[PDB]
Design brief:
4 copies of one chain form a homotetramer. The first copy, chain A, is α/β, with parallel strands linked by helices. Chain A contains 15 helices and 22 strands. In chain A, the strands form 5 sheets. Chain A has a 10-stranded mixed β-sheet, with helices on both faces. In chain A, helix 1 packs across helix 4, helix 1 packs antiparallel against helix 5 and helix 11 packs antiparallel against helix 12. Chains C, D: It catalyses: a ribonucleoside 5'-phosphate + H2O = a ribonucleoside + phosphate; a 2'-deoxyribonucleoside + a ribonucleoside 5'-phosphate = a ribonucleoside + a 2'-deoxyribonucleoside 5'-phosphate; IMP + H2O = inosine + phosphate; GMP + H2O = guanosine + phosphate.
Chain lengths: 500, 500, 482, 482
């Protein structure tokens, strides 16, 4: 028969095998992990605050006529501050999609600015990668701004920016203003203020969240580690646990703090994963901070501030292997470069919820592309290098392009977060680097036992996915160009020091 | 029905789509491309010459009792010059296999030296990646040397090398001597001399090679670009074309040079792909070099030396897109970082010939692992986070490990070139970065028409490969934690400026 | 006959020759250039607000009993976040002085943490260089913090930090909190607020400033470019120009803005020198911005915000050759990388004021050092490689050490900004690199005409400074047989 | 009374103080340290073999009519592979001299290719620094090649190279061929063979060398560490010590090897200073190697091959403090990074021999420069910012230029190794960084006792060298109101 699998929308997907039996400590980011912001309301709120900010610093009034359009941005686009393009690139820096403003640039014209349809993604001065869910409003705003200055006649388009009279406004300078304004929106607190004053509008709520976290604390420790301050965190978490019952209905409600062994605010991630700041214990009954740990009876509170990830693991008595860290952010090679053991990782990708719907509900699109590809192979079926034939594939290519575009638009104007045609995005490549497990939401762990063995799927290369495990009887001897015309004792047991 | 495909051992595998109709110029490396060296005779010859070299520079006589063992090395291993281990690592620097000498290190012991089972593959001072087919003898020799100094009592093992009396011999110093000696073997010409004096023993020969190259020159230009000098190249190529007939049997034999539009020796790759050296035209009737091009009638020869890849394309009148460059070496991002258009690429991986046999002839091994994995899923079938069950998977894991090791050993002691268990190797990752097409040999193009459209296979992520394109009817509403509780005009035609 | 030179405290010192005749545009930083903050009051103010910020985020109450000690910090020290040391290093990263808290570490134990008495300044993650005048309070605070936790009973000293029970607190973490608090004090305007509310206490005022700027404005253009906003710039600049007469005798007062052809606020240096931000005009009467220029009557206003160094140079019609940029900050070589000719530079270095006093008023210490060296050469005068004599030099070496340390202490506990003994500091090396001219203040341009040819002094090497041009067989090993 | 100093051509110059008393181990490079190659014969030999190598790989026959011109190259020039220029730059990458072939480029057109007269030396791919004595022939050859193709009819000059018809030949490509040919000439032993077959022509000989090394061997240990193999080392060292008497009068000759406690050949510097290669013993009578040490009687031999600097220091029982390493090569800061104390350094700089002759025998040129500067200060003596006077200085500036250029030409067409005008070269800066002591030859240690206290000379800044220690209200803008 076939392998049993849970329903698609409940699945946890496995990049690297993970024995959940061994997880003794579950760690959480808050933003977009426990506190999932409603889409597109929250993106559109960030957009407005940023636009409003730029206008009050001198950007034109026409900006206030921009409306956030959730169908345009995809996450992980690269902004080329030299030519002002949003780029969807693959794992190796090859261009997949190129948008100047809202104008999508065809392949040939792309080669003027990118002669090899390639970017050096390491040129951090030039290219800015919009990876986060917070980057989404900004991704759209950059396109809005490029489009407006392009089409407004008060400004003359040039290769690397706009002339306003005798003044040059480079794309890199505009981007600096957008970047400054997004920070300001977040770090002066205007967005949190608006968020907190209407939580029903802006934050998702779900009773399964206290349920799942209560089960996690039955088998291990549970901790929160957030860059937000305690005041914001308390307001958010109280809302998330505000039900007329506790974990199971008919049970007594209990405060959100009772679900955690350790609560860490003001984390200053990503610095948190280095040496961080000095750890201070927070006295929530007072609000007073004190570096270190309380010596007195106040030591039984669990709210902390600053610190480092290494320190938090000490407080929990949790070795790195024991920890599954659940969040929405792809971190670099910071944690594993350490002499200390790192955390295993569950990556929240909320966009996966819509993408799985495209995958399941648009089958007729996938079927047709498979059809067209099977027909194409039939047209070349018995041809080899002696054949002069040039089969007519013109129309079938045109229907391939037309079906593929239709699929793309099922995701949005910028296509799927994970691929374009046959090529994985840079983002997809980073998901595979960073995440041991991933899902639309951490809540999918509800549907798995804590003894579950998560087994990784082989990611197949072209010669594995298009060759069957069947014996191929060849009548001609294999060319010795291919075969090359083909003592330590062999190891007696498995040599895999990874176990995946 | 199913998609028609050529027989497995004739296939060209596609990472990135390529319209072969547009290829107007075919370029070749010589070594391990046109001139395929017999295995393991040629590896074993390189081994002996290197060992002999080290002995005459003071290394112990016991080295001459080493015999090359083709079942041990896999290509792409990393040599850690700090701890003297051969490492098989994945695309992200995670350890898969760790061999100190001929001792394979289990996972737990690995963590002493690699606390995160991770290496920073960028630490080029410490880690040396043995990617080439020429590296194979050296890969085995490094293991031989570590094993000998470990087990010989005249030397005391330490973490980073050996004590010989009061003298410390670091692994990094030993590696420097091995590296120096391999160079010497190649650059004083001892290996070419031995090769040339017994070409039947050392070089593969195949009549399909003149056939395929004659067909290529029917539709485009053909050129050779080799680091070897003309003298070696002539000896090799004359042997490769030495048949009592030409392209087709019953035709007149013709000299190998008649198969090329341009013959480039002394290329100094990889510098060749930068600014290179000054181009000089070679006068083979004389041997005299002259920088530039001959003004007189000698300008009708086609042998050149030095130069750059940009210059060679000018001579051919070949824009970069028009060129398919066929060879065995994975190059870095050198060619695409240029403002000039780069070559498309066909990668020769000779090991693919044995790997495809494992894939097809050891099906019963693959079937069992699929069985065991289907049984494992059955054991967790109706469990979720409320379940207390801990199903007994002990024996079925043991049979997984035992079957997986058996598969590994079908490839060699160091396993497949492309994966370990569920993880692709670093090498596999580089194949996907660099090669538009790849095969065990370029001769497989014989079985494809020159109008062929090579269409890339999707490389599927876990949520694509383990979810069907079937409509999933859910009775419970999807958690808004996953859905988030979900103007420019949309593009009307495909936006893919890559076309793959 | 000897060369004429202006009086020492009026001099502009010349590192690279500069023909003032060609300067047609004069550009100023404001902070510590036009607005010289009184020392040590201002450092002490920044120190106190930073300590209070730290205590308010949970640092111990004892910190509030630290008093800023201006005799301790010398600018340009390197804080080693690994071992908690303030370090004075030379141009090449050789150790000269090593302080742990307030304990000064001798040579031999220095070698335990620094085996070659060498740091790699490239290690930006480990070593933080405290080069600015704003960094002076933070330099002392770091020393205070390391001293406090080293001698506090509640804590256990370690190599890389301290234990508070079973909890480790790294110097790197602690330095991050000090770093964050100094930013916080500055970017909250706490410091700006206390400054503005008492300008006499914190800001130097001097009628020579309006005189010098009006003379520059007569020979060319003058521009201001500060990171500060307009409201703080206005308060400060209004104070600096608040005199009952204009710059000439019996002339009437005129506003500070009229001394400038272009006023740029919110500069966002150092980004300002690359692509910066988009330039916007400032309506001073309203305080509102508009990117570009106001399309109306307000186009005639001369106050802008943000922008870039290149936009401002084009706005003034000045090529890089025309411009002398006057300021207190040393910038990296990332403005010479541009493809248009960059500015020439005048580095304001306030410490030069007290350093020159030491140079001239402690001449007895220099003379004694010279005698001890002369006397020392006399001891070796008759010896070559054939000599077994080991002259007894310990007592004279003892006296050299005492005298050099006496000199060091005339500058402060960390010695001179520019050197320790025979070795130039890293800071001195960066002045040589960046500053075409330098003085203790820009005001010393008063004493020079705008046609002056500033001529660079040779920096002599040992084989130049210790052999005379006087005319005196030589080994072919030295001659290569020429 | 003035300070006693040894005669100028006998001096060891002191950059960092060094107590020779503490040196217990003396270590030598051989090439250009013990074996000083005669100039210009040796440079000319290397030049000719390199030209012939190039012509034999297809470069035009005209090259064989180049003659090495020793008056052109100064060591330490930077070859710009993009534009074909030899460049003399200062410590910070500022342009001082720019030669294209043999055409010297004035300031203003320099700015077309170098808008800030600045190069980024970090661009290792673009700029190649020609610092070694071995690099002198290649420095001139580069200039010859650029001059040849610029004025050859068959070629078309471009910005970054030349066209040979429809074919482009970049300076970068051409530089690669010169680079490869210089390696080829050296690593084929062509140069070593012609040297050994005529040692009188190419190698300086001097009986003072065996005297100095035997005196070192009496106070401590002496070691040799050369990249050369043993056969070439033996030929050369045998020649250098070939005298009818030993070092003392009427003493008998003894072999060169007996002057060394350890002879290391095949050093593979600079890798030698990291982990190097495995150390092997050399059986001199046989020429065979054995890694480690011979387990027999040959263990008493003192000739090794390969190894590392750390292995050799442990072999001698010398910590880094004990060692003075004597050599002609400037190394990067990648030996101070080690976790054991590194060597102290003596940099042999042959050009110092002729440079000191210029310093003392062209004093009239220095005096005139001094008068012109004094006279120039007198012209400005009475002017300050109120002055409109623009004194006429063109004729005196003209004479300064002529005189400075006259001085430059005493060193050679590229001027002094250490400076151009008021600006130290990049090379001078690297001597300051790397060399604790330096002289024109190691032989000047003869004139100093092994108990000598080498004392460093202050390198004065402009505000130190041009204001007297003599005692002379000051603006609070300079004083910060102290």
């Amino acid at each position: 028969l076939k392998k049993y699998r849970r329903e698609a929308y409940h699945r946890v997907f496995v990049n690297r095998s993970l024995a959940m039996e061994k997880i003794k400590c579950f760690g959480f980011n808050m933003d977009y992990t426990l506190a999932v912001y409603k889409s597109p309301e929250y993106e559109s709120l960030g957009f407005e605050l940023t636009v409003e900010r730029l206008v009050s610093i001198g950007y034109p009034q026409e900006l206030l006529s921009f409306a956030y359009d959730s169908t345009f941005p995809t996450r992980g686009l690269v902004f080329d501050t030299l030519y002002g393009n949003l780029l969807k690139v693959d794992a190796y820096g090859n261009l997949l999609v190129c948008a100047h403003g809202f104008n999508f640039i065809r392949g040939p014209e792309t080669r003027e600015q990118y002669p090899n349809k390639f970017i050096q993604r390491d040129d951090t001065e030039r290219f800015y990668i919009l990876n986060t869910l917070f980057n989404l409003p900004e991704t759209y705003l950059l396109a809005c701004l490029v489009d407006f200055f392009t089409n407004c006649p008060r400004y003359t388009s040039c290769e690397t920016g706009f002339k306003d009279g005798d003044l040059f406004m480079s794309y890199r300078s505009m981007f600096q203003d957008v970047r400054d304004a997004v920070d300001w929106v977040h770090y002066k607190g205007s967005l949190k203020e608006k968020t907190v004053e209407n939580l029903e509008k802006y934050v998702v709520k779900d009773g399964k969240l206290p349920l799942l976290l209560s089960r996690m604390k039955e088998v291990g420790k549970v901790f929160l580690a957030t860059n937000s301050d305690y005041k914001y965190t308390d307001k958010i978490m109280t809302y998330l646990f505000d039900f007329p019952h506790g974990p199971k209905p008919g049970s007594s409600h209990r405060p959100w703090q009772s679900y955690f062994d350790l609560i860490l605010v003001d984390a200053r991630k990503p610095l948190f994963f280095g040496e961080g700041t000095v750890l201070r214990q927070v006295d929530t009954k007072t609000g007073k901070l004190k570096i270190g740990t309380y010596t007195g009876p106040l030591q039984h509170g669990i709210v902390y501030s600053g610190g480092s990830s290494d320190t938090i693991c000490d407080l929990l008595g949790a070795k790195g292997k024991d920890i599954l860290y659940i969040g929405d952010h792809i971190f670099g090679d910071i944690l594993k470069s350490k002499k200390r053991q790192g955390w295993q990782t569950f990556l929240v990708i909320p966009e996966l919820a819509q993408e799985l719907h495209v995958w399941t509900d648009k089958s007729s699109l996938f079927e047709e592309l498979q059809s067209l590809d099977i027909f194409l192979a039939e047209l070349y079926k018995h041809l080899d290098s002696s054949s002069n034939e040039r089969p007519d594939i013109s129309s079938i290519q045109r229907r391939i392009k037309k079906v593929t575009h239709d699929m793309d638009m099922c995701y949005g104007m910028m296509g799927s977060l994970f691929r374009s045609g046959s090529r994985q995005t840079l983002f997809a490549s980073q998901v595979m680097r960073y995440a041991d497990l991933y899902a639309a939401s951490f809540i999918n762990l509800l549907y798995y036992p804590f003894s579950y063995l998560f087994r990784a799927a082989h990611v197949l290369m072209p010669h594995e996915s298009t060759v069957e495990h069947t014996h191929v009887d060849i009548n001609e001897m294999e060319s010795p160009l291919a075969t090359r015309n083909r003592f330590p004792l062999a190891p007696q047991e498995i040599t895999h020091c990874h176990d995946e």
